[PDB]
Tab-separated table of C-alpha atoms and ligand atoms in Angstrom:
chain	number	residue	atom	x	y	z
A	1	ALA	CA	102.998	94.116	135.910
A	2	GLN	CA	105.669	92.058	134.304
A	3	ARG	CA	103.827	92.235	130.965
A	4	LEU	CA	102.988	95.617	131.089
A	5	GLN	CA	106.616	95.859	130.690
A	6	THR	CA	106.422	93.723	127.116
A	7	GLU	CA	103.501	95.187	126.562
A	8	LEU	CA	105.271	98.758	126.026
A	9	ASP	CA	108.066	96.979	123.917
A	10	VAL	CA	106.372	95.403	121.716
A	11	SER	CA	104.339	98.589	121.660
A	12	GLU	CA	107.850	101.011	121.031
A	13	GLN	CA	108.868	98.456	118.763
A	14	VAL	CA	106.274	98.336	116.284
A	15	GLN	CA	106.474	102.133	116.329
A	16	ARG	CA	110.173	101.918	115.242
A	17	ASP	CA	108.950	99.870	112.357
A	18	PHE	CA	106.580	102.583	111.323
A	19	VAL	CA	109.190	105.812	111.843
A	20	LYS	CA	111.938	103.802	109.803
A	21	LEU	CA	108.918	102.567	107.405
A	22	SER	CA	107.788	106.317	106.656
A	23	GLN	CA	111.253	107.247	106.242
A	24	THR	CA	111.562	105.218	103.361
A	25	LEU	CA	108.269	106.394	101.737
A	26	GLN	CA	109.808	110.213	102.679
A	27	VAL	CA	113.062	109.828	101.172
A	28	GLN	CA	111.445	107.786	97.620
A	29	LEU	CA	109.387	110.776	97.891
A	30	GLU	CA	111.777	113.050	97.632
A	31	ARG	CA	113.311	111.656	94.883
A	32	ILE	CA	110.240	111.649	92.958
A	33	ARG	CA	110.206	115.933	93.693
A	34	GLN	CA	113.965	115.709	92.141
A	35	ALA	CA	112.837	113.666	89.035
A	36	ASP	CA	113.239	115.059	85.678
A	37	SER	CA	111.532	112.699	83.402
A	38	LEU	CA	109.177	109.645	83.588
A	39	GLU	CA	112.192	107.406	82.767
A	40	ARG	CA	113.903	108.259	85.944
A	41	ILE	CA	110.460	108.235	87.947
A	42	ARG	CA	109.334	104.717	87.084
A	43	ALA	CA	112.977	103.937	87.963
A	44	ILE	CA	112.329	105.139	91.371
A	45	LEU	CA	108.836	103.835	91.846
A	46	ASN	CA	110.912	100.091	91.039
B	1	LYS	CA	79.826	103.118	86.031
B	2	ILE	CA	83.153	103.427	88.470
B	3	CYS	CA	83.014	101.162	91.657
B	4	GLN	CA	86.055	101.406	93.460
B	5	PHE	CA	86.985	99.779	96.337
B	6	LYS	CA	88.914	99.068	99.923
B	7	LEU	CA	90.074	95.318	100.462
B	8	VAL	CA	91.991	94.261	103.171
B	9	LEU	CA	94.765	91.194	102.829
B	10	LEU	CA	95.120	89.008	106.336
B	11	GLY	CA	97.034	86.113	107.612
B	12	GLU	CA	100.151	84.849	109.882
B	13	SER	CA	103.203	85.509	108.510
B	14	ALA	CA	104.744	84.224	105.796
B	15	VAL	CA	102.059	82.345	104.009
B	16	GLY	CA	101.970	84.518	100.718
B	17	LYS	CA	100.058	87.678	101.252
B	18	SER	CA	102.307	90.287	99.004
B	19	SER	CA	103.318	87.691	96.728
B	20	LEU	CA	99.604	87.484	95.803
B	21	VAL	CA	99.025	91.239	95.539
B	22	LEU	CA	102.523	90.643	93.667
B	23	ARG	CA	101.061	88.350	91.320
B	24	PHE	CA	97.172	89.301	90.591
B	25	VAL	CA	98.798	93.411	90.284
B	26	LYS	CA	102.204	93.289	88.683
B	27	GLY	CA	102.065	90.055	87.512
B	28	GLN	CA	105.180	88.474	89.708
B	29	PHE	CA	106.839	85.750	91.742
B	30	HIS	CA	109.911	86.916	93.887
B	31	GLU	CA	111.158	83.393	95.315
B	32	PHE	CA	112.590	85.387	98.397
B	33	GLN	CA	110.068	87.833	99.457
B	34	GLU	CA	111.089	89.820	102.286
B	35	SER	CA	108.580	89.750	105.479
B	36	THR	CA	106.416	92.934	104.855
B	37	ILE	CA	106.853	96.330	107.278
B	38	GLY	CA	104.009	96.993	108.509
B	39	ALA	CA	101.365	97.200	104.944
B	40	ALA	CA	102.143	97.722	101.600
B	41	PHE	CA	99.567	99.428	99.458
B	42	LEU	CA	98.530	98.640	95.730
B	43	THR	CA	95.824	99.326	93.028
B	44	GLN	CA	94.556	97.939	90.450
B	45	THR	CA	91.271	98.387	87.808
B	46	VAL	CA	89.337	95.411	86.132
B	47	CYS	CA	86.892	95.318	84.533
B	48	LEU	CA	83.517	92.965	84.470
B	49	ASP	CA	82.062	93.499	81.778
B	50	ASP	CA	80.456	96.857	81.598
B	51	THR	CA	81.415	98.427	84.977
B	52	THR	CA	84.796	99.250	86.014
B	53	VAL	CA	86.604	98.014	89.220
B	54	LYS	CA	89.333	99.536	91.145
B	55	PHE	CA	91.160	97.368	93.833
B	56	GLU	CA	92.752	99.648	96.251
B	57	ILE	CA	94.332	97.406	97.928
B	58	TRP	CA	96.301	96.919	101.991
B	59	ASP	CA	98.624	94.218	101.818
B	60	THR	CA	99.413	94.320	105.995
B	61	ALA	CA	102.226	92.815	107.428
B	62	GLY	CA	100.949	89.559	109.332
B	63	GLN	CA	103.340	88.826	112.222
B	64	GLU	CA	101.914	89.476	115.803
B	65	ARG	CA	103.632	92.390	116.996
B	66	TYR	CA	101.405	94.312	113.824
B	67	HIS	CA	98.221	92.387	115.470
B	68	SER	CA	96.510	95.536	117.293
B	69	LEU	CA	97.280	97.579	114.320
B	70	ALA	CA	95.296	95.804	111.973
B	71	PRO	CA	91.644	97.627	112.501
B	72	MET	CA	93.310	100.713	111.258
B	73	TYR	CA	93.518	98.763	107.826
B	74	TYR	CA	90.290	97.032	107.350
B	75	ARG	CA	87.982	99.360	109.145
B	76	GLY	CA	86.050	100.243	106.454
B	77	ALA	CA	87.299	98.126	104.026
B	78	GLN	CA	83.987	96.090	101.818
B	79	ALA	CA	86.277	93.265	101.172
B	80	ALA	CA	88.771	91.013	103.066
B	81	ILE	CA	90.899	88.139	102.194
B	82	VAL	CA	92.116	85.931	104.914
B	83	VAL	CA	95.204	84.084	103.776
B	84	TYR	CA	97.150	80.445	105.370
B	85	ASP	CA	99.782	78.148	103.782
B	86	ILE	CA	98.129	74.968	103.276
B	87	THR	CA	101.466	73.320	104.502
B	88	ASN	CA	100.934	74.887	108.054
B	89	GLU	CA	97.881	73.793	109.668
B	90	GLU	CA	98.889	76.380	112.615
B	91	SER	CA	98.713	79.524	110.300
B	92	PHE	CA	95.107	77.689	109.318
B	93	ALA	CA	93.974	78.099	112.760
B	94	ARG	CA	95.185	81.327	112.917
B	95	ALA	CA	93.368	82.282	110.342
B	96	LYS	CA	90.487	81.422	111.373
B	97	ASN	CA	90.800	83.997	114.241
B	98	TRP	CA	90.963	86.508	111.543
B	99	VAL	CA	87.697	85.812	109.977
B	100	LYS	CA	85.929	86.151	113.707
B	101	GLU	CA	87.632	89.281	114.294
B	102	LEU	CA	86.319	90.167	111.342
B	103	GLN	CA	82.740	89.393	111.969
B	104	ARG	CA	83.127	90.942	115.187
B	105	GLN	CA	84.543	94.359	114.590
B	106	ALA	CA	84.257	95.180	111.107
B	107	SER	CA	80.958	95.784	108.650
B	108	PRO	CA	78.882	92.901	108.741
B	109	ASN	CA	78.478	93.473	105.019
B	110	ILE	CA	81.783	92.683	103.954
B	111	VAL	CA	83.218	89.854	101.258
B	112	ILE	CA	85.144	87.732	103.381
B	113	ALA	CA	87.746	85.752	101.183
B	114	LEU	CA	89.673	82.542	102.775
B	115	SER	CA	92.830	81.937	100.565
B	116	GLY	CA	94.427	78.265	100.999
B	117	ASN	CA	97.893	79.638	99.605
B	118	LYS	CA	101.019	77.842	98.294
B	119	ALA	CA	98.711	74.774	96.576
B	120	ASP	CA	101.921	74.113	94.505
B	121	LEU	CA	103.396	72.706	97.473
B	122	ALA	CA	100.677	69.950	97.692
B	123	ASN	CA	104.061	67.971	98.202
B	124	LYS	CA	103.686	68.481	102.319
B	125	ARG	CA	99.926	69.673	102.425
B	126	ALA	CA	98.804	70.007	106.250
B	127	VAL	CA	95.492	71.005	105.867
B	128	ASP	CA	93.129	68.963	103.965
B	129	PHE	CA	90.982	71.183	101.180
B	130	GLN	CA	87.900	69.517	102.303
B	131	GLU	CA	88.500	70.727	105.736
B	132	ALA	CA	89.202	73.792	104.605
B	133	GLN	CA	86.248	73.807	101.987
B	134	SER	CA	83.636	72.996	105.613
B	135	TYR	CA	84.984	75.651	107.400
B	136	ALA	CA	84.327	78.108	104.648
B	137	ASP	CA	80.931	76.917	103.797
B	138	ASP	CA	79.672	77.771	107.034
B	139	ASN	CA	80.773	81.160	107.952
B	140	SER	CA	80.201	82.232	104.379
B	141	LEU	CA	83.351	82.285	103.257
B	142	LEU	CA	84.726	82.498	99.484
B	143	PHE	CA	86.951	79.796	99.873
B	144	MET	CA	89.468	79.008	97.084
B	145	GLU	CA	93.021	77.178	96.806
B	146	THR	CA	95.964	80.035	95.200
B	147	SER	CA	99.726	79.757	93.931
B	148	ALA	CA	101.394	83.219	93.841
B	149	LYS	CA	104.341	81.217	92.346
B	150	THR	CA	101.834	79.386	89.404
B	151	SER	CA	99.356	82.186	89.454
B	152	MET	CA	96.455	79.089	90.039
B	153	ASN	CA	93.002	80.553	90.780
B	154	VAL	CA	94.803	83.991	92.229
B	155	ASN	CA	92.758	86.282	89.535
B	156	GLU	CA	89.472	84.115	90.047
B	157	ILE	CA	89.546	85.120	93.832
B	158	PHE	CA	89.421	88.356	93.217
B	159	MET	CA	87.452	88.629	90.500
B	160	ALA	CA	84.619	86.689	92.770
B	161	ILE	CA	85.554	89.068	95.177
B	162	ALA	CA	84.169	92.153	92.548
B	163	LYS	CA	81.067	90.323	92.172
B	164	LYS	CA	80.205	89.267	95.339
B	165	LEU	CA	80.952	92.938	96.475
B	166	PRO	CA	77.173	94.223	96.601
C	1	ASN	CA	104.571	104.405	140.882
C	2	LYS	CA	106.080	101.376	139.127
C	3	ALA	CA	102.876	100.524	136.932
C	4	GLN	CA	101.776	104.027	137.049
C	5	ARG	CA	104.248	106.165	134.810
C	6	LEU	CA	104.760	103.200	133.176
C	7	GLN	CA	100.906	102.619	132.184
C	8	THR	CA	101.593	106.085	130.288
C	9	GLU	CA	104.789	105.525	129.034
C	10	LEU	CA	102.463	102.926	126.879
C	11	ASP	CA	99.702	105.192	126.727
C	12	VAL	CA	102.418	108.012	124.108
C	13	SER	CA	103.702	105.191	122.799
C	14	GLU	CA	100.452	104.115	121.240
C	15	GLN	CA	99.709	107.877	120.592
C	16	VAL	CA	102.815	108.378	118.661
C	17	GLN	CA	102.572	104.909	116.813
C	18	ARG	CA	99.039	105.576	115.653
C	19	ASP	CA	100.565	108.663	114.332
C	20	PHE	CA	103.103	106.946	112.527
C	21	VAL	CA	100.780	104.127	110.653
C	22	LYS	CA	98.651	107.248	109.733
C	23	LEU	CA	101.694	108.669	108.507
C	24	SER	CA	102.801	105.882	106.493
C	25	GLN	CA	99.479	104.781	105.324
C	26	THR	CA	99.167	108.650	103.826
C	27	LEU	CA	102.163	108.613	102.360
C	28	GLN	CA	101.888	105.193	100.896
C	29	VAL	CA	98.508	106.374	98.833
C	30	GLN	CA	100.582	109.184	97.559
C	31	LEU	CA	103.383	107.361	95.834
C	32	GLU	CA	101.243	104.849	94.566
C	33	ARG	CA	98.792	107.721	93.170
C	34	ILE	CA	101.911	109.054	91.380
C	35	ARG	CA	102.349	105.306	89.640
C	36	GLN	CA	98.855	105.693	88.343
C	37	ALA	CA	99.833	109.322	87.031
C	38	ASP	CA	99.454	109.812	83.303
C	39	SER	CA	101.771	112.963	82.917
C	40	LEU	CA	104.776	114.462	85.070
C	41	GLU	CA	102.657	117.455	85.787
C	42	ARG	CA	100.207	115.308	87.160
C	43	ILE	CA	102.793	114.171	89.392
C	44	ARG	CA	103.665	117.649	90.220
C	45	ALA	CA	100.021	118.219	91.875
C	46	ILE	CA	99.864	114.824	94.019
C	47	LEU	CA	103.186	115.533	95.326
C	48	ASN	CA	101.449	119.230	95.976
C	49	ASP	CA	98.217	117.850	97.700
C	50	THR	CA	97.541	117.271	101.524
C	51	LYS	CA	98.059	114.959	104.070
D	1	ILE	CA	130.845	115.684	95.248
D	2	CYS	CA	129.633	115.818	98.558
D	3	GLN	CA	126.404	115.005	100.073
D	4	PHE	CA	125.534	115.359	103.891
D	5	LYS	CA	122.443	114.279	106.536
D	6	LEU	CA	121.599	117.322	108.333
D	7	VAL	CA	118.494	117.676	111.006
D	8	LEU	CA	116.536	120.696	112.772
D	9	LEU	CA	115.546	120.310	116.527
D	10	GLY	CA	113.921	122.487	118.960
D	11	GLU	CA	110.915	122.978	121.328
D	12	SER	CA	107.796	122.716	119.076
D	13	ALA	CA	106.728	126.135	117.023
D	14	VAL	CA	110.088	127.430	117.397
D	15	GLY	CA	110.660	127.773	113.400
D	16	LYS	CA	111.958	124.698	112.574
D	17	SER	CA	109.888	123.565	109.404
D	18	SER	CA	109.643	127.475	108.266
D	19	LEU	CA	113.248	128.012	108.572
D	20	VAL	CA	113.853	124.481	105.973
D	21	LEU	CA	110.461	125.664	103.697
D	22	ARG	CA	112.641	129.401	103.412
D	23	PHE	CA	115.769	127.280	102.610
D	24	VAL	CA	114.506	124.888	100.090
D	25	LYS	CA	111.437	126.905	98.376
D	26	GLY	CA	111.683	130.409	99.644
D	27	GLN	CA	108.294	129.468	101.073
D	28	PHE	CA	107.245	131.461	104.369
D	29	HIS	CA	104.072	130.379	106.064
D	30	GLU	CA	102.280	132.949	108.823
D	31	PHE	CA	100.438	129.765	110.359
D	32	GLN	CA	102.437	126.745	109.383
D	33	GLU	CA	100.781	123.564	111.041
D	34	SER	CA	102.426	121.283	113.617
D	35	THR	CA	104.909	118.794	111.909
D	36	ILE	CA	103.632	115.279	112.849
D	37	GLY	CA	106.454	112.451	112.792
D	38	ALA	CA	109.105	114.271	110.578
D	39	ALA	CA	109.705	115.897	107.389
D	40	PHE	CA	112.568	115.050	104.419
D	41	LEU	CA	113.318	117.388	101.989
D	42	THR	CA	116.477	118.002	99.897
D	43	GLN	CA	118.574	121.015	98.571
D	44	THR	CA	121.547	121.232	96.459
D	45	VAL	CA	123.323	124.024	95.769
D	46	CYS	CA	126.928	124.806	94.103
D	47	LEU	CA	129.481	126.165	97.241
D	48	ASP	CA	131.764	127.800	94.847
D	49	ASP	CA	133.034	124.962	92.527
D	50	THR	CA	131.538	121.787	94.001
D	51	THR	CA	127.815	120.292	94.555
D	52	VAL	CA	126.952	119.914	98.372
D	53	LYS	CA	123.809	118.158	98.668
D	54	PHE	CA	121.630	118.685	102.201
D	55	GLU	CA	119.367	115.817	103.068
D	56	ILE	CA	117.512	117.983	106.133
D	57	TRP	CA	115.410	115.897	108.354
D	58	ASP	CA	112.807	118.351	109.855
D	59	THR	CA	111.561	116.700	113.319
D	60	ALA	CA	108.273	117.430	114.848
D	61	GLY	CA	109.671	119.205	118.179
D	62	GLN	CA	106.330	118.118	120.513
D	63	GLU	CA	107.469	116.216	123.518
D	64	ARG	CA	105.917	112.810	122.947
D	65	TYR	CA	108.086	112.312	120.009
D	66	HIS	CA	111.582	113.071	122.110
D	67	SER	CA	112.691	109.387	122.566
D	68	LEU	CA	112.439	109.351	118.550
D	69	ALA	CA	114.987	111.879	118.210
D	70	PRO	CA	117.540	110.176	117.790
D	71	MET	CA	116.289	107.507	115.111
D	72	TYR	CA	116.690	111.088	112.747
D	73	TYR	CA	120.218	112.206	114.575
D	74	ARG	CA	121.815	109.339	114.567
D	75	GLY	CA	124.331	109.052	111.397
D	76	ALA	CA	123.829	112.655	110.879
D	77	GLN	CA	126.721	115.190	110.095
D	78	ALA	CA	125.095	117.720	110.721
D	79	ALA	CA	122.261	119.988	113.386
D	80	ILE	CA	120.717	122.901	113.343
D	81	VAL	CA	118.981	123.775	116.856
D	82	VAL	CA	115.999	126.209	116.780
D	83	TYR	CA	114.874	128.162	119.645
D	84	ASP	CA	112.409	131.345	119.419
D	85	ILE	CA	114.386	134.765	120.365
D	86	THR	CA	110.952	135.760	121.890
D	87	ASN	CA	110.889	132.431	123.929
D	88	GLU	CA	112.921	132.054	126.875
D	89	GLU	CA	111.530	128.720	127.503
D	90	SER	CA	112.185	127.584	123.959
D	91	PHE	CA	116.114	128.976	124.554
D	92	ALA	CA	116.449	126.091	127.634
D	93	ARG	CA	115.293	123.723	125.850
D	94	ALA	CA	117.464	124.183	123.225
D	95	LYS	CA	120.642	123.538	125.639
D	96	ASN	CA	119.856	120.359	126.150
D	97	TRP	CA	119.341	119.595	122.627
D	98	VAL	CA	122.996	120.689	122.488
D	99	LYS	CA	123.912	118.243	125.594
D	100	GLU	CA	122.034	115.427	124.298
D	101	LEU	CA	123.784	115.642	120.681
D	102	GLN	CA	127.123	116.121	122.320
D	103	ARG	CA	126.503	113.136	124.082
D	104	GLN	CA	124.701	111.051	121.863
D	105	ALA	CA	124.849	111.874	118.559
D	106	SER	CA	128.483	111.127	116.049
D	107	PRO	CA	131.316	112.958	118.019
D	108	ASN	CA	132.167	115.062	114.627
D	109	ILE	CA	128.230	116.166	114.384
D	110	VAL	CA	128.860	120.431	112.937
D	111	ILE	CA	126.027	121.535	115.829
D	112	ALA	CA	124.274	124.747	114.750
D	113	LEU	CA	122.272	127.520	116.805
D	114	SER	CA	119.122	129.431	115.342
D	115	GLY	CA	118.174	132.488	117.590
D	116	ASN	CA	115.083	132.049	115.683
D	117	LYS	CA	111.858	134.781	114.741
D	118	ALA	CA	114.678	137.264	115.341
D	119	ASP	CA	112.787	140.050	113.128
D	120	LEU	CA	110.559	140.208	115.963
D	121	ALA	CA	113.291	142.193	118.110
D	122	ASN	CA	110.704	143.796	119.753
D	123	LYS	CA	109.830	141.090	122.101
D	124	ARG	CA	113.473	140.057	122.363
D	125	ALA	CA	113.160	137.655	125.685
D	126	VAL	CA	116.246	136.085	124.457
D	127	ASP	CA	120.074	138.472	124.743
D	128	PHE	CA	121.817	138.263	122.125
D	129	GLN	CA	125.000	138.117	123.884
D	130	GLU	CA	123.870	135.586	126.994
D	131	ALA	CA	123.273	133.050	123.786
D	132	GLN	CA	126.399	134.229	122.145
D	133	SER	CA	128.550	133.196	125.022
D	134	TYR	CA	126.641	129.950	125.402
D	135	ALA	CA	127.309	129.006	121.572
D	136	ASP	CA	131.061	129.941	121.926
D	137	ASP	CA	131.946	127.874	125.689
D	138	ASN	CA	129.678	124.671	123.321
D	139	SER	CA	131.909	125.563	119.937
D	140	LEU	CA	128.147	125.721	117.992
D	141	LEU	CA	127.619	127.681	115.092
D	142	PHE	CA	125.009	130.489	116.503
D	143	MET	CA	123.090	133.033	114.287
D	144	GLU	CA	120.237	134.789	114.491
D	145	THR	CA	118.175	133.889	111.574
D	146	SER	CA	114.164	134.933	110.552
D	147	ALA	CA	112.482	132.727	108.114
D	148	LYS	CA	109.631	135.240	107.792
D	149	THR	CA	112.827	138.021	106.309
D	150	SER	CA	114.821	135.050	104.845
D	151	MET	CA	117.628	136.570	107.042
D	152	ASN	CA	120.872	134.233	107.890
D	153	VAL	CA	118.818	131.456	106.275
D	154	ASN	CA	121.068	130.733	103.369
D	155	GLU	CA	124.131	131.940	105.645
D	156	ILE	CA	123.228	129.241	108.229
D	157	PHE	CA	123.377	126.416	106.082
D	158	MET	CA	125.846	127.293	104.032
D	159	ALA	CA	128.394	128.048	107.074
D	160	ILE	CA	127.413	124.604	108.563
D	161	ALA	CA	128.366	123.276	104.498
D	162	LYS	CA	131.484	124.476	104.913
D	163	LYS	CA	132.520	124.198	107.955
D	164	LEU	CA	131.779	120.009	107.527
D	165	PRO	CA	135.177	118.321	107.151
E	201	GNP	N1	105.793	77.765	96.585
E	201	GNP	C1	105.170	79.029	96.874
E	201	GNP	N2	105.587	79.679	97.844
E	201	GNP	C2	105.218	81.267	97.858
E	201	GNP	C3	103.963	81.332	97.358
E	201	GNP	N3	103.139	82.288	98.080
E	201	GNP	C4	104.447	83.111	98.795
E	201	GNP	N4	105.849	82.171	98.756
E	201	GNP	C5	107.056	82.037	99.055
E	201	GNP	O1	107.008	82.421	101.030
E	201	GNP	C6	107.462	83.371	101.133
E	201	GNP	C7	106.550	84.460	102.045
E	201	GNP	O2	106.298	85.289	101.039
E	201	GNP	P1	105.400	86.467	101.520
E	201	GNP	O3	104.901	86.941	100.269
E	201	GNP	O4	106.873	87.660	101.760
E	201	GNP	O5	104.408	86.161	102.774
E	201	GNP	P2	103.867	87.134	103.929
E	201	GNP	O6	102.470	86.756	103.703
E	201	GNP	O7	103.429	88.253	102.660
E	201	GNP	N5	104.623	87.422	104.674
E	201	GNP	P3	104.308	88.913	106.253
E	201	GNP	O8	103.089	88.782	106.229
E	201	GNP	O9	105.183	88.333	107.468
E	201	GNP	O10	105.241	90.160	105.291
E	201	GNP	C8	108.456	83.816	100.034
E	201	GNP	O11	109.912	83.005	99.707
E	201	GNP	C9	107.297	83.805	98.468
E	201	GNP	O12	108.160	83.091	97.990
E	201	GNP	C10	102.971	80.378	97.007
E	201	GNP	O13	102.157	80.484	96.315
E	201	GNP	N6	103.719	79.019	96.334
E	202	GNP	N1	108.327	136.185	113.105
E	202	GNP	C1	108.394	135.630	112.797
E	202	GNP	N2	107.529	133.192	112.972
E	202	GNP	C2	107.970	132.972	112.644
E	202	GNP	C3	109.097	132.474	111.986
E	202	GNP	N3	109.565	130.617	111.800
E	202	GNP	C4	108.047	130.540	112.235
E	202	GNP	N4	107.715	131.328	112.623
E	202	GNP	C5	105.982	131.074	112.889
E	202	GNP	O1	106.154	130.317	114.265
E	202	GNP	C6	104.954	129.699	113.541
E	202	GNP	C7	104.525	127.739	113.725
E	202	GNP	O2	106.162	127.593	112.879
E	202	GNP	P1	106.690	125.859	112.514
E	202	GNP	O3	107.636	126.732	111.411
E	202	GNP	O4	105.308	125.115	112.587
E	202	GNP	O5	107.482	125.798	113.897
E	202	GNP	P2	108.452	124.306	114.117
E	202	GNP	O6	109.045	124.247	115.158
E	202	GNP	O7	107.922	123.721	112.918
E	202	GNP	N5	106.858	123.216	115.072
E	202	GNP	P3	106.600	121.605	115.532
E	202	GNP	O8	108.137	121.482	115.651
E	202	GNP	O9	105.771	121.802	116.434
E	202	GNP	O10	106.791	121.330	113.831
E	202	GNP	C8	104.125	129.861	112.520
E	202	GNP	O11	103.408	130.704	112.924
E	202	GNP	C9	105.248	130.497	111.976
E	202	GNP	O12	104.556	131.131	111.081
E	202	GNP	C10	110.285	133.493	111.894
E	202	GNP	O13	111.184	134.051	111.191
E	202	GNP	N6	109.348	134.842	112.379
E	203	MG	MG1	104.110	90.531	103.615
E	204	MG	MG1	107.365	121.744	112.053
């Protein structure tokens, strides 16, 4: 129906929110894995 | 004795869930907090006297699109805080629906807390304290007005959850 | 034909959505663990766990 | 002095996560689990007189994730498209990934073609020359690799870094 389409849109909008969110978390984890000391690390977690 | 558990914050967007958590966990308050995307996670260990209590805290994005996901955060939670803006009657009714949902979906044993946040903004209070108190008493909900801005009753409500937790 | 392939496209959507919700939850628990880690050697172990 | 985002694409099970594991950690796993969503690693290697950082996104290649690939390769300076030299279907699938990038990715993207699992030449279902020809006609950087034996893994990556503007 008309609503099934709008339902899909909302669905895919949230889906993309969490894709983006996961991309950020993974980049942050990666920077942590490259971190040399607890200094840099706590800096990244900020 | 170590007792850690899972707690979830629920409520309409922009009522102060994250702020509230930032307060409790990192003791901060950002005036221009940006809307949460999806959800945020933080932990915090607080001792009652003899036993250590670890808070596993899920601060959910409140906007309506994320509604259907909420279970993936509160399922298997032993505590919840439903938050609303005392200067917003619509955010108080929305808060009522979160309570009904938890009562239907979540464990019957879950400790639910109701937060009337932004008490510091009583300059434009749109939700009478006594009406919020009453609503709470009937649903057996730990109610408490709070201010993430001033830290009023922030630590208490968390602390009050831990004690009421079986 | 219309509301057919559209119901499925939704379900696949919801399935992907949940994958990425579980993905983010796992990553956040791990960033927080790391935030709680005492030593730098503790952090390497966390970064090496499972997801 | 130079960091660039690179993305791997290919049909599920062609070797993409293994390729990146090799290049990044020298590892390889006979039983790598299928990727969920996407994984991210970096690698800083000094060209010859300048350090270039690889920001590498390793996408899940299952069909249900297809609509999402754009969200990884938009803004990418480089892509690797991977197929299994023992899987004729995976090669066909790679052709359309290339097509999709030519139409939708940045116009100056460097696209490499990886004939992966070339260590299993004993089951070659994809003629090396049938694939070398396709790559030349599409201006791709074709190169058969093995994540197991590490063959051409550093090369292909280094060829990409080289051809980048
Ligand atoms: N005066 C005051 N302002 C507050 C209080 N709590 C939050 N705010 C303000 O309200 C706004 C939104 O707060 P925020 O914590 O982001 O809300 P939220 O409930 O997490 N929003 P969402 O659900 O969309 O993520 C911020 O600008 C913040 O400063 C409070 O106790 N007092
Ligand atoms: N013989 C051989 N096997 C390989 C090679 N590279 C990967 N494999 C094998 O192929 C299988 C799948 O590898 P994997 O890296 O997970 O594939 P993928 O393309 O990432 N799959 P997905 O897109 O689902 O995440 C594994 O059993 C792995 O060991 C290679 O060069 N030679
Ligand atoms: Mg928030
Ligand atoms: Mg993979």
